[PDB]
Amino acid sequence: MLSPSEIPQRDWFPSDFTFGAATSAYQIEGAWNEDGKGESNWDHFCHNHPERILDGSNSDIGANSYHMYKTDVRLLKEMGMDAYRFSISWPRILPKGTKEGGINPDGIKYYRNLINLLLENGIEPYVTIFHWDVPQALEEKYGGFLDKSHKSIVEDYTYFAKVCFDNFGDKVKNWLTFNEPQTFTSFSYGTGVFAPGRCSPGLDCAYPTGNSLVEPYTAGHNILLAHAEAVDLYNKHYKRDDTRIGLAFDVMGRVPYGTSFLDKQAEERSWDINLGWFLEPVVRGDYPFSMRSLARERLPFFKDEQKEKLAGSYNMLGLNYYTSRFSKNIDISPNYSPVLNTDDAYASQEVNGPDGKPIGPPMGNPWIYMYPEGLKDLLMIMKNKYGNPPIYITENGIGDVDTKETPLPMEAALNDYKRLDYIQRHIATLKESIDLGSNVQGYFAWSLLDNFEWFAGFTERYGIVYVDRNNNCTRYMKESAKWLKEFNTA
Amino acid sequence: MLSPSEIPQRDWFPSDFTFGAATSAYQIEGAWNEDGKGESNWDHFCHNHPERILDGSNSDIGANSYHMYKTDVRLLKEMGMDAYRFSISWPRILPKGTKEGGINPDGIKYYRNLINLLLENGIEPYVTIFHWDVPQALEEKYGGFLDKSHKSIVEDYTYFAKVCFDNFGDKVKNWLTFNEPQTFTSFSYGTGVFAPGRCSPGLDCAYPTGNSLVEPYTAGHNILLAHAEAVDLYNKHYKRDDTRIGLAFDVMGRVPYGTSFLDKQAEERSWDINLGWFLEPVVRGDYPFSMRSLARERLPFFKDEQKEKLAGSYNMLGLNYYTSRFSKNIDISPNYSPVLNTDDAYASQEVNGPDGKPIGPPMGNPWIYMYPEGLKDLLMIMKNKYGNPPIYITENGIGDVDTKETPLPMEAALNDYKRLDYIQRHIATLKESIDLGSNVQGYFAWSLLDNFEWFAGFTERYGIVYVDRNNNCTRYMKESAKWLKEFNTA
Numbered sequence A, B: 001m002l003s004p005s006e007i008p009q010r011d012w013f014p015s016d017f018t019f020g021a022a023t024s025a026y027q028i029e030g031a032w033n034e035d036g037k038g039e040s041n042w043d044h045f046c047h048n049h050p051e052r053i054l055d056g057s058n059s060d061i062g063a064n065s066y067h068m069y070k071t072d073v074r075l076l077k078e079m080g081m082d083a084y085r086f087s088i089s090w091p092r093i094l095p096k097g098t099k100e101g102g103i104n105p106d107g108i109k110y111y112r113n114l115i116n117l118l119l120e121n122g123i124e125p126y127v128t129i130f131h132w133d134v135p136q137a138l139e140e141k142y143g144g145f146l147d148k149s150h151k152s153i154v155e156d157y158t159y160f161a162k163v164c165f166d167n168f169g170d171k172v173k174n175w176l177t178f179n180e181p182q183t184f185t186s187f188s189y190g191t192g193v194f195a196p197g198r199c200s201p202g203l204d205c206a207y208p209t210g211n212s213l214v215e216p217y218t219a220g221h222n223i224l225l226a227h228a229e230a231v232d233l234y235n236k237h238y239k240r241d242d243t244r245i246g247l248a249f250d251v252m253g254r255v256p257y258g259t260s261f262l263d264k265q266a267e268e269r270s271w272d273i274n275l276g277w278f279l280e281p282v283v284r285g286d287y288p289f290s291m292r293s294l295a296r297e298r299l300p301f302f303k304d305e306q307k308e309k310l311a312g313s314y315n316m317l318g319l320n321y322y323t324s325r326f327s328k329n330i331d332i333s334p335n336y337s338p339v340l341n342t343d344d345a346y347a348s349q350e351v352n353g354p355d356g357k358p359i360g361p362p363m364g365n366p367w368i369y370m371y372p373e374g375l376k377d378l379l380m381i382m383k384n385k386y387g388n389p390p391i392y393i394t395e396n397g398i399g400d401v402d403t404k405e406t407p408l409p410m411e412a413a414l415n416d417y418k419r420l421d422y423i424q425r426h427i428a429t430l431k432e433s434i435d436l437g438s439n440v441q442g443y444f445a446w447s448l449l450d451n452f453e454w455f456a457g458f459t460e461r462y463g464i465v466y467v468d469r470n471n472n473c474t475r476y477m478k479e480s481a482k483w484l485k486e487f488n489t490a
């Protein structure tokens, strides 16, 4: 428990610093088939394979923010947030996913109203163009980001970005092309736990007929090409002195398992395959050496024209930080054979150190362990190794477990002191990091709202605002939310 | 030019610290076919391909130390040296290279007399068992260290090692199984510049029917297996509290070419492929990750019983230091394709930095540039990453160029102030390194005598003592030698 002289204060951090909360379309919008919205990959996945989501639920309603957005802004204003990060639904804007299919007027209106309302209350909008919701039409036509032609998906995504620039560019000054490329590719086509549900034969997912060692890279390579085409388009027709564009990386901190230098090497291969995978190409135009040396031919190459577009394609970078892991070395030998794309790093990511203890206290769900130190390590790598570009912690928080056999009574849910302590500790390390020369610019608490947690369904509540599903999704502030309120209000 | 107060004094190092000079059998011995000595790979190479040595010479006489050894010890005593490092001629001991062939009595006698004489003058002998001189009989029988079975050469070397332990074990308290494995394998089977003269088709060497991307590793792997087997035998039937055994690595310091982090990575792959190649295996029982990930299947795997034998097989380690290089990154791509085994490091070793200036001033020959800092960097890596074992700089010095076109007059030859300066500087860094916690134990000036410089023939003089080839190889102390004399006597 933090002492008083230790609780973050707003006068720490300059006036520029922005504080806000974040959400993602499919996770909170609901109205999956209303006002012309086209079906998405997740609509498709949840409806055809509820056994694949922990509690057999879907997000046909989610937090119902499509109809309750006005309330969301109200809560944001009341908390005194500076910004709000949300994503746009590709299929709600382009039902068929293509330029051919046409632009859905109702989709444009919804985001238009939200953006205007946000700005009216002094809340700066940070827009995530793509947050895993792929138009099923594009998925059936060519597998989406699996597009073997590496063209279709790029042209389509680009247009989708264009439409967004065309209708929201005048009000939006902060764009994020993609969210968590690594999580998306590794989970959708590696362990098949996400959206499509594909994985290598022998593995356990809905469609075990893919190749966990190849598809994640194929998809990731297309995303990168798409990113480039998009930023090139943004900089040539929409960029303004006061507007910025980038993308957000998912990343866990990596600490050497033991004292051996072999683990130090394992740690580096880990940062490389998790963060470097997508970060290095947007900064220098190619993948990390370790990956090219290990994944070999399974990692596509970029033409020279592509290398140019990629390198330096951002004005800011988003970082989604939740935990860390101990990286333990795995030697190269004729025995060991990678199974998942992530095993190409020749290192196991342990939760418990050699002393049998967890890297940090368990926050409740099956993977979040508190280790704010890891967020400092990350900010120092961005500063000393990667040009120290503007950083935004676009995601950070924990998920309070709430199941059938172990229901979370509302009163407990609102007294999320564990979440409060977590948020505060990380905010503090940013103040530390800034003084250490980090170029961090803002912090977004992940989940303004309790919502659909992908394959976890509604078994976890990540919001700072509670959402009562038993009474038409009416929201209530938790202590974390209340603390954030006085923090921005003091 | 080095000022006084900066010039190293003997009282700077502990009384424990040892100082000496070094040589190698083929390079000085001579009497290539006397008293039953068997033909070696170099006898064979020089006699059949005089065009492959700069001045078309051989070492049939060399410094004729086989007949003048008594004089060599005298010089050593006069200089007040603590030790003398020399190597034994495998074919002079085992004419046919095998146990079957028998032991040559005269060969035993020569080394026996030398060792006794050395000890009589208080000079401790550091014996290098193998210094590139492979019996031609084995070379012809199965290609020597190219032995595809990874059995014959290991078995024959071990016996050779045994014979040495049997006849000199009682007097010798310091053994070195191999000398510069890297230089030997890379030059003999990589560039084909050494002994056998083998290289890949497409390259230029005596026998371009080999494979520069494989044979060096094959030979290196056998050497390692051989080393392990020799030390195991030593430790079980010969080791004594006061006796030690190890090997000597050739190694150039590596400095990042530029500021990009990519060069830092290139630097590490360089230390790895140069030093790590043989060092890591004797310290932890296996080649470094980088190499296994880059040379792939071209680098043989060690059994488990072999990993155990290899790990820890040494009580001390020898280091041969001459210069350093800037390591410049090379990306993996469909264009670049390694040709030489050393290319597997994906890094060019530049002599001049980004500013067009050499890493250090030139010492005369085609490759020695003065960079004492590199030695410090090397001793720090040994101290911090590899267990900080007792280290001996078994080689260090420069080569005064003396050709037919630009001959070096004896007067200039003796006034080797450039060498003296160079020797003094490195001895100082040793003192700096000790103060930084290095476990260095002694220093050996490379070349007590001017001698045959392999493919360079007699175009370079490395000795601290001059050898007049026009007057029966009579020796004269150069200024460097004289300085070393007063250094040890104060």
Ligand SMILES: O=[N+]([O-])c1ccc(S[C@@H]2O[C@H](CO)[C@@H](O)[C@H](O)[C@H]2O)cc1
Pocket: A024, A180, A183, A250, A320, A367, A395, A399, A453, A454, A456, A462
């Ligand atoms: O180990 N894991 O199973 C896992 C690791 C990272 C993430 S990223 C993060 O996961 C949140 C919780 O599932 C979700 O709300 C956001 O959309 C995402 O950015 C998801 C799941």
Ligand SMILES: O=[N+]([O-])c1ccc(S[C@@H]2O[C@H](CO)[C@@H](O)[C@H](O)[C@H]2O)cc1
Pocket: B024, B027, B180, B183, B250, B320, B367, B395, B399, B452, B453, B454, B456, B462
């Ligand atoms: O790049 N090169 O040309 C080169 C580098 C290192 C060495 S090692 C050293 O080379 C000396 C002169 O070639 C010789 O006297 C000794 O036997 C060896 O230890 C030989 C040649």
